[PDB]
């Protein structure tokens, strides 16, 4: 069997008097008084080896130095003196046998500090990506990706349990989810490309047309996008799939998959059912399709008592959006906020305090008319700061939300844990407020509420959707909908979406007569593990919970792609590159 | 809740008196002394709804026709007679109601038959890609692709409970001098991502970051011939090992492929696997990938013939025989000759066994040594012996292929499933010496002062795992000693700017302590064909390409607008 007899850092008192075998890097040595001490390090933490000048192991420990890799044997004995910021602080070992397996010279930054417990200074992320096989020697790095084993393993768990099939679908297939492809030439016939999938979106329902009724996969998606915040060029999906089911069962299934995930990967308790909110609730509660729900600051929509108001800025507009903030701002505070508002489409911010009585600052003279309906639709309290956006709905909710979000942090507030919700009944279309065009929400095989079918034609925008999303502390973890297998109203949906006969024959034709030989009611969702694991582990970006991603171009310093390749390949491909 | 109690296949005796809410495609349709029987089919099987002339749903039994999905209502009652090919077979469905949820063209092609228990006749498979999401309506692919599901969670289950960290790894890498597919980066006309051959550069770097343990359900990409029944990508079981001899890999992957078959298949599989050198199984079977379903192992019987006048014997650097339990025709033996022959031999001698003598073609050179050659291939009356003679290489790479050819032209049974493992490969192979496997393939460290004064004799820490004559598994202990590194190196005359042009990254890394570690890749396709006794790789793949690459059901490869690939900085040429 193996060499070692036990993981370095498992050693505890109930193995004192116990001769061990272990192998493990070196953390750090310290010699005092002759003696040699090693703090040897595996992934279960560090134990302390103690060489003694009387030992045959001495020699050996004199030429070690960090990082090397050795292998220990010894007597394992209580410290004089125990460490309490190790789970080994109590015992060491006192090495009657060292062997050198591999010399290692100094890492280009430190990976000790972590093991001890101790803090971790920053290091230059191009630098750790660099060298990213050292930085995965941390603990941290260790640990994130631990829990992203931890999390999948609980996936397949609960997905096999609920009589989920895992299939695994192409990865080189043909040119939806709104994003730029990447493409694979083919070799034996230039101008013939491959593309990576954005998604299995299409073969996932094809499953469902083949009868496996519930499916899942851990997918990996690429998608060729420019300005995204935290983009990697490709990223991991849970995606699943379910037939003859209403909206309803797919998030139920869901909210109960995520929670047996935090349960077991973290040991966190989520409360069942997730809260519930529409589209138009969570707009006009929060100006975003994205809520945070660990704080409150809710909007109130206050349009109807400026009808006979001489501020013509606020009785014309469609909506005045107003937001009790528990805190007298400065000027500069509020010029920040104000900043925030005018880069979402506000016309602009408006501030001022509330007093024992009357009104004080910015607009507070426009605020002194309006006071006994006002005071009890905002409950604001003296010593508050009111901010007001008016303009269209959309504009002066989302405005106003993340002028929310960006006083949530000016005022520090503590906001904990987790808080899930759903979002849902989404309106099938968005308008564009800069192209001045109708663009979907979700994919266009998303269907349409049924009661809203003959809307289609007479009043497209008032068509909702029968799409969700999931939500985490403000953040788009997951999204679905239930599609459309009827082949009838999919091509109908094309035509509505600016996709004439061509187009769909050219880019769907496969699939529109996929759903002439009987396709079934069904639906699905897909998250975004990256995303979810970045929240799970408080890490500020994706990169931190994938082994080895990219940096913020898209590039790899590690490997050196991407990179050029030799004229003679990229001939016999029967490409080139076009002079500029 | 779910509109459906049960699925339809799932429905037993025990649901006598419930009534029930089913969903799935219409199988088959009969009409009988006026009642209307409609084979009710989802992913757990058949079951029989019966429509009476007073039920509501009579009217639209009637008009339903086979593959229209439909949600039935009715009451479960006892067949009068059961139909035992059916796992619902005692049990009926009385229906109540019926509700068509989508009509269906007629399929192409039939996929009825199987879920009644009945042979399905062949389909051209061309047509069966390009409908694949009717191919797998059929019983035989669920089945195909449930088991690989059971495959892959068992696996999970096991390397979990050992340890192993899973770590996915990056699908857009670094190009380097088999072809690599290539994905052009947008922004910098003239570079290139590649997708990876493999993990192996990754899985070598997470042992160097001290993760011990690591496996992957890895996706590989190799633009190289598709003939052999190969596919552009294709799925490995990867996994990689720290602190490891290849005694602890082989006993891992042994327990584990026991636990797989277990699990997925309810098969037994005896542990441990026999083992064989590369040597041995050259000897006994003239193959580096045995099929131990059936005996007929190959004899070295060259030393019998030193002092036999007979020429092509006598002066031969190794005689293979091999001896057939029955007489074989003049046709076969030609047969067995021509195998032999295609095999790059000079030839295949023959001769009947006797009582007393032999009898047939060099049987008169066979008598002078007639004991020692029964006692050396155990030979018996009514046997046929076969000689390949030539170099020690191609007469058992020729009789070994003679070999399999002879269990075809005799019928022998061939069942179950036979694991081995082919370990002590030679490390290199002439051409100047190269690397039989992969550079980084440590050496055996009692041949380690062979590798400059005989580097041939040198063997390598790399084992295969076999079954039934295929290779499912390869791996091997890697190299750890970057000093050892540039010796196999200066040994293969790759110099330092081709080592950086290909490893740079990796043989920097092995600079800051790598520990001993191993591991190895499972063919996961190949695999699971076989467990399914499938003929190609394509059956245990949901959307696979054609023999050809191509994939009817999509159309890709496809052109795309020459606007999306001007956005690239690209043109064809
Ligand atoms: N996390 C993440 C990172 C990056 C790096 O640049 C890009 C991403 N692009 C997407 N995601 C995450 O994937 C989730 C689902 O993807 S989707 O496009 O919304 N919908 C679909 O794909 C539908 N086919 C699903 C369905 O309808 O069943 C999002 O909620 C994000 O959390 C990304
Ligand atoms: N099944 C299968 C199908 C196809 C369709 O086109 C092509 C294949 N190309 C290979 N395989 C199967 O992968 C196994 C391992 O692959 S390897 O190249 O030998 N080694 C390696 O890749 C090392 N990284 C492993 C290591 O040393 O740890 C083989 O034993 C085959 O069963 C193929």
Same mark, same amino acid.
Do not use: I, Q, V
């Given at each position: 069997g193996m060499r070692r007899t036990h993981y370095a850092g498992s050693l505890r008192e109930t193995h004192v008097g116990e001769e061990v075998v272990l192998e493990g890097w070196v953390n750090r040595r310290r010699d005092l008084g002759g003696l040699i001490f090693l703090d040897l390090r595996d992934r279960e933490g560090l134990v302390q080896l103690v060489a003694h +000048?009387?030992? !045959?192991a001495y020699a050996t420990a004199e030429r070690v130095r960090p990082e090397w890799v050795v292998r220990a044997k010894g007597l394992v004995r209580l410290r004089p $003196? !125990?460490? +309490?910021?190790?789970?080994?602080?109590?015992v060491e070992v006192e090495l009657s046998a060292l062997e050198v397996l591999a010399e290692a010279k100094t890492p280009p930054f430190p990976v000790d500090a972590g093991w001890r417990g101790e803090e971790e200074k920053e290091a230059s992320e191009e630098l750790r990506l660099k060298y990213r096989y050292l930085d995965l020697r941390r603990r941290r790095m260790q640990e994130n990706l631990r829990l992203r084993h931890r999390v999948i393993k609980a996936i397949w768990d609960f997905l096999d349990r609920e009589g989920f099939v895992q299939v695994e679908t192409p990865f080189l297939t043909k040119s939806p989810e709104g994003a730029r492809d990447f493409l694979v030439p083919y070799?034996? $016939? #230039?101008?013939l490309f491959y593309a990576l999938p954005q998604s299995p979106q299409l073969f996932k329902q094809m499953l469902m047309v083949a009868g496996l009724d519930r499916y899942f996969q851990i997918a990996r998606c690429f998608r060729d996008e420019d300005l995204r915040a935290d983009r990697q060029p490709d990223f991991t999906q849970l995606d699943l799939e379910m037939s003859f089911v209403e909206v309803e069962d797919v998030l139920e299934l869901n909210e109960r998959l995520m929670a047996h995930v935090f349960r077991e990967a973290l040991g966190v308790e989520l409360p069942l059912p997730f809260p519930r909110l529409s589209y138009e609730e969570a707009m006009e509660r929060y100006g975003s399709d994205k809520p945070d729900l660990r704080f409150g600051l809710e909007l109130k929509e206050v349009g109807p008592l400026f009808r006979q108001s001489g501020f013509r800025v606020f009785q014309e507009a469609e909506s005045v959006k107003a937001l009790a903030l528990p805190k007298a701002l400065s000027r500069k505070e509020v010029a920040e906020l104000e900043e925030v508002a005018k880069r979402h489409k506000a016309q602009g911010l408006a501030w001022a305090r509330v007093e024992e009585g009357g009104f004080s600052g910015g607009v507070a003279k426009f605020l002194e008319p309006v006071r006994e309906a006002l005071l009890q639709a905002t409950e604001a309290r003296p010593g508050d700061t009111l901010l007001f956006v008016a303009g269209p709905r959309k504009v002066a909710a989302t405005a106003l939300g993340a002028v929310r979000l960006r006083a949530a942090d000016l005022l520090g507030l503590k906001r904990e844990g987790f808080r899930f919700l759903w979002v849902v009944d989404f309106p099938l279309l968005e308008w564009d407020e800069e192209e001045e065009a109708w663009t979907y929400m979700?994919? #266009?095989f998303t269907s349409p509420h049924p009661e809203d079918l +003959?809307?289609? $034609?007479?009043? +497209?925008?008032?068509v909702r959707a029968l799409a969700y999303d999931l939500v985490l502390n403000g953040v788009e973890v997951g999204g679905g909908s239930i599609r459309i297998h009827d082949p009838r109203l999919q091509a109908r949906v094309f035509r509505l979406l600016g996709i004439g006969e061509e187009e769909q024959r050219e880019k769907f034709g496969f699939f529109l007569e996929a759903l002439e030989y009987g396709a079934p009611p069904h639906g699905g969702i897909a998250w975004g593990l990256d995303r979810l694991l970045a929240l799970m582990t408080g890490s500020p970006s994706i990169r931190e919970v994938i082994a080895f991603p990219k940096n913020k171009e898209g590039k790899d310093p590690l490997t050196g792609a991407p990179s050029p390749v030799p004229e003679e390949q990229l001939r016999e491909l029967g490409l080139m590159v076009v002079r500029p």
């Open positions: +000048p009387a030992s !045959p $003196e !125990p460490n +309490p910021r190790l789970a080994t602080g109590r070799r034996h $016939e #230039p101008g979700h994919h #266009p +003959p809307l289609l $034609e007479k009043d +497209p925008g008032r």
